[PDB]
């Protein structure tokens, strides 16, 4: 399914989207991707969209 995220933070802001099963693996890879671009925040995940935020 595809999933997104929400980057609210201090220097890129934008949305992602990339394919998972669940939830569960979609927040892993998201996290890995913040990880990837330093990106240190507070998160949440809205079900009925699909869709996470990170907020710096």
């Known amino acids: 399914m595809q999933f997104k995220l929400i980057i609210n933070g201090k220097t890129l802001k934008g949305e992602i989207t ?3 099963v669940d939830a569960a693996e979609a927040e892993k890879k998201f996290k ?6 330093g990106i240190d925040g507070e998160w949440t995940y809205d079900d009925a ?8």
């Open 18 to 20: 990339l394919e998972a």
């Open 49 to 56: 969209t699909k869709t996470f935020t990170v907020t710096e």
């Open 32 to 37: 890995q991707y913040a990880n990837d671009n």
